[PDB]
UniProtKB/Swiss-Prot annotation:
Protein name: E3 SUMO-protein ligase SIZ1
Family: Belongs to the PIAS family.
Organismal lineage: Eukaryota, Viridiplantae, Streptophyta, Embryophyta, Tracheophyta
Gene assigned in the entry: SIZ1
ZnF region ranges: PHD-type: 10-65
The species this protein was found in: Oryza sativa subsp. japonica (Rice)
Superkingdom of the organism of origin: Eukaryota
Length: 68
């Protein structure tokens, strides 16, 4: 919203919404600590199917820095 960005709990999703979506998830990087909407970062093999929810989730920052 304005100053609701905690150093350990910071919701940064592509939707720019720090609300309580279907399911939230925190980055697996202690140097990031960024929460994101699982549904937003979920890529199901099909539309309306079982999305792929991996054990370790890395935001865009970590994703690029990792080049995975
Ligand atoms: Zn989102
Ligand atoms: Zn991250």
């Amino acid at each position: 919203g304005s100053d609701s960005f905690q150093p350990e709990a910071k919701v940064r999703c592509i939707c720019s919404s720090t609300m309580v979506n279907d399911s939230m998830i925190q980055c697996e990087d202690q140097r990031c600590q960024v929460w994101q909407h699982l549904n937003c970062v979920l890529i199901p093999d099909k539309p309306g199917e079982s999305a792929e929810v991996p054990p370790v989730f890395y935001c865009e920052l970590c994703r690029l820095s990792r080049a995975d």
